[PDB]
Amino acid sequence: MKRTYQPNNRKRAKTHGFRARMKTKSGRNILARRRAKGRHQLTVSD
Amino acid sequence: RQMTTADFSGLTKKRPEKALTEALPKTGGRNNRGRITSRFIGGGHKRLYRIIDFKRRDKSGVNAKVAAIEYDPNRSARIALLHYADGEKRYILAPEGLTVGATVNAGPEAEPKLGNALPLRFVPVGAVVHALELVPGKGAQLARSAGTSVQVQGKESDYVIVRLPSGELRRVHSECYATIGAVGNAEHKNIVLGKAGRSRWLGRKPHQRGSAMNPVDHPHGGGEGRTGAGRVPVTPWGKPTKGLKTRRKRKTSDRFIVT
RNA sequence: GAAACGAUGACUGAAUCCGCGCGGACCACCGCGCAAGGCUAAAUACUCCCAGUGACCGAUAGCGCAUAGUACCGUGAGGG
RNA sequence: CCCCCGUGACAGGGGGCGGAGGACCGAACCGGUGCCUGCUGAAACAGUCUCGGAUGAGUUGUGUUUAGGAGUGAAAAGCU
RNA sequence: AACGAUAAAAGAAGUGAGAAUCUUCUUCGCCGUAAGGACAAGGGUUCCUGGGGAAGGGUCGUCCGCCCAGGGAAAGUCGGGACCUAAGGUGAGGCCGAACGGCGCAGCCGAUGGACAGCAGGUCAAGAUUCCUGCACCGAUCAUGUGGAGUGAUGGAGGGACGCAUUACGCUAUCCAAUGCCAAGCUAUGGCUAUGCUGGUUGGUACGCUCAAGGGCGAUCGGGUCAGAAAAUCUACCGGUCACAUGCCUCAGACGUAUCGGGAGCUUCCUCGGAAGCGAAGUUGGAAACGCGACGGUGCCAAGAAAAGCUUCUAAACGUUGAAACAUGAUUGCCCGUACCGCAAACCGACACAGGUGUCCGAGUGUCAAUGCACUAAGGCGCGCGAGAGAACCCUCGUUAAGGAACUUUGCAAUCUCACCCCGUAACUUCGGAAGAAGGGGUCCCCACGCUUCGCGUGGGGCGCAGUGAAUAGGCCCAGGCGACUGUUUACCAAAAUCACAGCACUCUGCCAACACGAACAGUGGACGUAUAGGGUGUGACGCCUGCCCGGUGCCGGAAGGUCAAGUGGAGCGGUGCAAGCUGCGAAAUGAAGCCCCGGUGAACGGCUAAGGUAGCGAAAUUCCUUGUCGGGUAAGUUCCGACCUGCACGAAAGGCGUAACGAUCUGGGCGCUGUCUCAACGAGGGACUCGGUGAAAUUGAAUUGGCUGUAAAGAUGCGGCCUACCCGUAGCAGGACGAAAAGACCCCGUGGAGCUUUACUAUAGUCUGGCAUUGGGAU
RNA sequence: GAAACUUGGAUUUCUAACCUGAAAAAUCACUUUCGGGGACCGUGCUUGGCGGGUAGUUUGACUGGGGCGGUCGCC
RNA sequence: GAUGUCGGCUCGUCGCAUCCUGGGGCUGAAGAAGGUCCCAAGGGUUGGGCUGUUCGCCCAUUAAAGCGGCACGCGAGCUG
Numbered sequence A: 001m002k003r004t005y006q007p008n009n010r011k012r013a014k015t016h017g018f019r020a021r022m023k024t025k026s027g028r029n030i031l032a033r034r035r036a037k038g039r040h041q042l043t044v045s046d
Numbered sequence B: 001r002q003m004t005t006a007d008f009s010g011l012t013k014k015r016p017e018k019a020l021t022e023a024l025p026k027t028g029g030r031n032n033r034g035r036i037t038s039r040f041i042g043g044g045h046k047r048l049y050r051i052i053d054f055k056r057r058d059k060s061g062v063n064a065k066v067a068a069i070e071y072d073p074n075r076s077a078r079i080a081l082l083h084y085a086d087g088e089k090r091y092i093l094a095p096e097g098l099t100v101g102a103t104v105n106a107g108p109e110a111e112p113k114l115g116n117a118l119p120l121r122f123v124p125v126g127a128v129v130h131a132l133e134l135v136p137g138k139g140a141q142l143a144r145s146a147g148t149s150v151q152v153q154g155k156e157s158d159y160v161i162v163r164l165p166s167g168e169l170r171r172v173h174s175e176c177y178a179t180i181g182a183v184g185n186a187e188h189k190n191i192v193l194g195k196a197g198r199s200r201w202l203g204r205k206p207h208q209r210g211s212a213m214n215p216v217d218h219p220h221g222g223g224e225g226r227t228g229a230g231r232v233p234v235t236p237w238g239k240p241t242k243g244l245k246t247r248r249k250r251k252t253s254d255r256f257i258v259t
Numbered sequence C: 001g002a003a004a005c006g007a008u009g010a011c012u013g014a015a016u017c018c019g020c021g022c023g024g025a026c027c028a029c030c031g032c033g034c035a036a037g038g039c040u041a042a043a044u045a046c047u048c049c050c051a052g053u054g055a056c057c058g059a060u061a062g063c064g065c066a067u068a069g070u071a072c073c074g075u076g077a078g079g080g
Numbered sequence D: 001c002c003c004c005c006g007u008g009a010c011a012g013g014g015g016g017c018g019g020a021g022g023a024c025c026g027a028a029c030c031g032g033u034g035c036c037u038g039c040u041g042a043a044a045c046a047g048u049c050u051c052g053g054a055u056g057a058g059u060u061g062u063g064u065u066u067a068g069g070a071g072u073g074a075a076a077a078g079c080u
Numbered sequence E: 001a002a003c004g005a006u007a008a009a010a011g012a013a014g015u016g017a018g019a020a021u022c023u024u025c026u027u028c029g030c031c032g033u034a035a036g037g038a039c040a041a042g043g044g045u046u047c048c049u050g051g052g053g054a055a056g057g058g059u060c061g062u063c064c065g066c067c068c069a070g071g072g073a074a075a076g077u078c079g080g081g082a083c084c085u086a087a088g089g090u091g092a093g094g095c096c097g098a099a100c101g102g103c104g105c106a107g108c109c110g111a112u113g114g115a116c117a118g119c120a121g122g123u124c125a126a127g128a129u130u131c132c133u134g135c136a137c138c139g140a141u142c143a144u145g146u147g148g149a150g151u152g153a154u155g156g157a158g159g160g161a162c163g164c165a166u167u168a169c170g171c172u173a174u175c176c177a178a179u180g181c182c183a184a185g186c187u188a189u190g191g192c193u194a195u196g197c198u199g200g201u202u203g204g205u206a207c208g209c210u211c212a213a214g215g216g217c218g219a220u221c222g223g224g225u226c227a228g229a230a231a232a233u234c235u236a237c238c239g240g241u242c243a244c245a246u247g248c249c250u251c252a253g254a255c256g257u258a259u260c261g262g263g264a265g266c267u268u269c270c271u272c273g274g275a276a277g278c279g280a281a282g283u284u285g286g287a288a289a290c291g292c293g294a295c296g297g298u299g300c301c302a303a304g305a306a307a308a309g310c311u312u313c314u315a316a317a318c319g320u321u322g323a324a325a326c327a328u329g330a331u332u333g334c335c336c337g338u339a340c341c342g343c344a345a346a347c348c349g350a351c352a353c354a355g356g357u358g359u360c361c362g363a364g365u366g367u368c369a370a371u372g373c374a375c376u377a378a379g380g381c382g383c384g385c386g387a388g389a390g391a392a393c394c395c396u397c398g399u400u401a402a403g404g405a406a407c408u409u410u411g412c413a414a415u416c417u418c419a420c421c422c423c424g425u426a427a428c429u430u431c432g433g434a435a436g437a438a439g440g441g442g443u444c445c446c447c448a449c450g451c452u453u454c455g456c457g458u459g460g461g462g463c464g465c466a467g468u469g470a471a472u473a474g475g476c477c478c479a480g481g482c483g484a485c486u487g488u489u490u491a492c493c494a495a496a497a498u499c500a501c502a503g504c505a506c507u508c509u510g511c512c513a514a515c516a517c518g519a520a521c522a523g524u525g526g527a528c529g530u531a532u533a534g535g536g537u538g539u540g541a542c543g544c545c546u547g548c549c550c551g552g553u554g555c556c557g558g559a560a561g562g563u564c565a566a567g568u569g570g571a572g573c574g575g576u577g578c579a580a581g582c583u584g585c586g587a588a589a590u591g592a593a594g595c596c597c598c599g600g601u602g603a604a605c606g607g608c609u610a611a612g613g614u615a616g617c618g619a620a621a622u623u624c625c626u627u628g629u630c631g632g633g634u635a636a637g638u639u640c641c642g643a644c645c646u647g648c649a650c651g652a653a654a655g656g657c658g659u660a661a662c663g664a665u666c667u668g669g670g671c672g673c674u675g676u677c678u679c680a681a682c683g684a685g686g687g688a689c690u691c692g693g694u695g696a697a698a699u700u701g702a703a704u705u706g707g708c709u710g711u712a713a714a715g716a717u718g719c720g721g722c723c724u725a726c727c728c729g730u731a732g733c734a735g736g737a738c739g740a741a742a743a744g745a746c747c748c749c750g751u752g753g754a755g756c757u758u759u760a761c762u763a764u765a766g767u768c769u770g771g772c773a774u775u776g777g778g779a780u
Numbered sequence F: 001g002a003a004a005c006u007u008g009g010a011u012u013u014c015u016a017a018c019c020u021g022a023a024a025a026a027u028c029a030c031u032u033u034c035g036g037g038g039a040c041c042g043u044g045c046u047u048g049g050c051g052g053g054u055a056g057u058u059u060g061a062c063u064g065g066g067g068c069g070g071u072c073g074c075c
Numbered sequence G: 001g002a003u004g005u006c007g008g009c010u011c012g013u014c015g016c017a018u019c020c021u022g023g024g025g026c027u028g029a030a031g032a033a034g035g036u037c038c039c040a041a042g043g044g045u046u047g048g049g050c051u052g053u054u055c056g057c058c059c060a061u062u063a064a065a066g067c068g069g070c071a072c073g074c075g076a077g078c079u080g
């Protein structure tokens, strides 16, 4: 019963990361969107 | 020659002259970004590249001596490791009957003797050559394989006739180089390949018949039990003859392409 | 469509003041205008924010929150 | 490869020796054959027993790459 | 109902408001290729100490991985970075593109790999190649002495450098034996009085003429310039002289000597249990790696990263007087990680979950061998409800008279068989196999003699019902069907006769190849391949083999003709103006690829009118009637084998018929065994039951909820009539409550949906083709 | 009937467009020495063709269930 | 907004249009053995081969090897 989630810090951070959302503008859209949702918390700090 | 036995196989090949020596790395891959373009080919064992001299021009006027004749993967062609008087070692594909320690002169004035690698205007008619330079300069795109040959037929002005392995006759100008003799690797073709996975030592996972796939996957897909309709590939073109060439420059340099 | 006029993608390629374009096939006549150069307040839209107000709410209502995008759910976008 | 016998249309045969194999039995590991059990489970797919592979088309870690009419697929329309 | 594995507990002592559950003791049981130990991931203080007891803990709690506070984490040398590079990522210039953006040489990023200086011990409650002690090592700057000269680049070279299998020699780790040593003491039960019992029995460094397997080593003089951009004393080559035994070179490791450690224990104060001191001998014999000597040896095809450090050479430069190099102190040593969990109560699984998780170590005895199997060291643990009871029923087991498959869809399940040695072994075969065929014997102990060893051989003696005395442990055979085969597949009902498979065939493709991804005259895959290659398609080892029909559909080939678009072009027709003129529909000719037309094509779509089944097979995975007819087997045979043929509706690469071997494949039979059965019994354990703790769920119009029979929307507790029936529970059963579950998945309906198909409609990516540009000159 | 300022067409060929390879300079860029191809190919605009490769959809009703058979208006 | 379908197994229970047994009338019934009709539901009504089969055919028996109902009785009982 190998499940789905395999914590791997480097994986997690290299997809999904603040840096990673810089890479692209769909990402940068996500960022601004979230900033706007009210101080949410964000992608790297979690 | 071959090996023969019981325990479930047939026919490996046999080779002399062993070194393991001096050229670049290569790395296997199939897909190219997204969906695999050239199909299958995901298996294979760890080959290395051997830089081989097709051009063989700048060595003009300079004789060489065969060091050894070596096995190279990614090939089907015996390669002779050449050494020149210059000191420069260069891998050149080895033709049939080319011995070890023979002497191969390069350049245009060199006699139509084995391996001597000359242009066509100096090659007497009917003679057998391999490794044929298509456009003067660059290199040989023609007859690089096993047991493959070309026969020179009477030239035109700067241009010569050649019979390529396919049987097709080609206009190729005499300004182009070629190597004397045919390139054997004996007869490679009659190797048995034994069982599967041997086909996997190299390429990978061969034909998956569209007829076992599904309507979603292939035109052949679907139905109840083994059958057919149609007759066509990934996209509806077909097995049998459809001239796939486009009307073009090259097409005027071909005389009687048949087969 | 009887389809004028504007607008370009391809290809042609003019006149210039008794000249040029328009007036909804087109022609004459009668009128209207002078392209292929530029810039240009004001009345106009919006509400993150601030003020005032209300036959608006008053704790299952009113924004989701009488503060929380928190707890919590998700790999993530996201949701709450 | 090294010895001996043998070559009448016939191939070979024996001993030494060697260490080949999608060879064999079998733990690890990979896998799920059949029964039972479990069925508001220990568990949103297992347990016991039994069974398959077990130097190969093998198993496995890390890093990467491929995705929505798209990918991937020893091909179920399976997986994403 | 349940309290999360049937590995198991018991007593005493203690603390406390309260103890089955926390502490201590002593026993018991469980794991021990782990249920021990070390990392990596991941998790974050879960670690240690002192408190605490709401809640979390499936009960309890004084206890905890919970709550509170306080401490704990130490590096020039380990792992990472200031080093290198792989796939991939990026990428100035550069190539494309409605935008956003997609590519891309060099270069740079990127460990999963290369490179690289330390070992032995000690200890906080909690750290350890990190602190401490012992000796050590690497680089860097400076200082003293030698030297007393060259140094050696963003550049060349050499080197780093690489596979699988198998295997010789020598070790060590490491384990075993003993009347070797050392150390402590006792002993009783019947004996032993040590020859018994218990424990320990060496780690680092340095030196050394000692022992030592194995490992790899050429050298200079020189020639050509055409080689490495040029260079070069370097590297490649070529040639000459000294490399047939040697032998320079190296020590794994052993031995010695010394030294620093450690060592069983003994001592001593004990602040409730630790702390400090002291310190015995290290022997002979045997076993031994996947580690080390090494980059060993041999064989094989499928042919086994790169780059930097490293070594060598010059260009430039500075100096040739103070160089390089050596060693001699000295100084210098940055950043991050480092606790604890880490096959699990701390990671992923909603949970203190029977699941999952990459690597390393993983002792002893017995056992051909072993990481197997039993027990067991070290270590860890008894799985956070418990106590009685000994009903039904259920689960997991043990034994069973006579019989032996009669069970039943089917021997499903469960027996039987079971290792090793010997003897022995069939049809059939592709000569390998079938095969562990089948079958039969052996197996323990003691003594004697013999060999080649863990041991075995022979003889004799012994003991039990039995000697792989317990655990691990194949039942077998004869026939068929399907696929040859190993393999692959429906994560979570299908493992197959599916898929793939070597082999075969058709066909495409001449290289900016065909083909395929794609805004794209970008790039890339095909391929750093070149027809013995690559794409596509179908068959599907091997053996014999593969027939007839091209009329239609397609594909290839053909040119005399039939139609065929824009388009160059404008006779003609009509409008308006007095007029020159300006304007509307618009044709004969010129018009390509298509289609009609001809011919060929079948391991092309296909058919048995274009022809009608050539082998071979046939009631077959194809068969209707049908349990066909005969025969085999059986007391009895709708299945099964064999024929036959009347083939409803076999047939030759959607292959025909065969075929050894293969198979958790499907079918029929036989042997053996047997609780499957006649037909069930007794026994065990874990639930069920009872007491104490904690305490769910689906469901639920409400209920004061009987039987018959009749009615009612056509299956009555609830209406009628008649019968029965004191109140309430506990254990049980499964007939009813059209019992629960999911707004039936069948069916039908909806001018509802979506996947798929094609000679349905319509467009379209793609692709073909004429004209027009890019687009020029000269000849006929 | 010859000459020409000439205009299009097919042929042939050429090199200055363009494509493309080697060369010390891995993709480009270049004076480049060159080599091959070449008014083609490609490419843009249009013309006609093919196009289940893909896309959007269509595929009636009555009916002693639906389907099949039949039946839809008129006398 | 679900009344689970064949057959078996298990467990029964009812009807009588009686397969057996019991009591009768007639018989073209001497006896013995039958034929047929009436009365009669207390009890009884075997084991295998073939088949998923109910059925049916067969083996060996028997006093006999009845026919049907019970949602073609019975899956909150089992199978499958």
Ligand SMILES: [Mg+2]
Residues within 6 Å of the ligand: B212, B213, B214
């Ligand atoms: Mg299929």
Ligand SMILES: [Mg+2]
Residues within 6 Å of the ligand: B215, B218, B219
């Ligand atoms: Mg299709």
Ligand SMILES: [Mg+2]
Residues within 6 Å of the ligand: B219, B220, B221, B222, B223, B228, B229
């Ligand atoms: Mg099809």
Ligand SMILES: [Mg+2]
Residues within 6 Å of the ligand: C005, C006
């Ligand atoms: Mg206009």
Ligand SMILES: [Mg+2]
Residues within 6 Å of the ligand: C059
């Ligand atoms: Mg209130």
Ligand SMILES: [Mg+2]
Residues within 6 Å of the ligand: none
């Ligand atoms: Mg609110």
Ligand SMILES: [Mg+2]
Residues within 6 Å of the ligand: D023
């Ligand atoms: Mg094997």
Ligand SMILES: [Mg+2]
Residues within 6 Å of the ligand: none
């Ligand atoms: Mg209970």
Ligand SMILES: [Mg+2]
Residues within 6 Å of the ligand: E004
């Ligand atoms: Mg428990």
Ligand SMILES: [Mg+2]
Residues within 6 Å of the ligand: none
């Ligand atoms: Mg603790």
Ligand SMILES: [Mg+2]
Residues within 6 Å of the ligand: E053
């Ligand atoms: Mg408490």
Ligand SMILES: [Mg+2]
Residues within 6 Å of the ligand: none
């Ligand atoms: Mg509690």
Ligand SMILES: [Mg+2]
Residues within 6 Å of the ligand: none
């Ligand atoms: Mg002893």
Ligand SMILES: [Mg+2]
Residues within 6 Å of the ligand: E187, E188
């Ligand atoms: Mg005593």
Ligand SMILES: [Mg+2]
Residues within 6 Å of the ligand: none
């Ligand atoms: Mg001792």
Ligand SMILES: [Mg+2]
Residues within 6 Å of the ligand: none
């Ligand atoms: Mg630690």
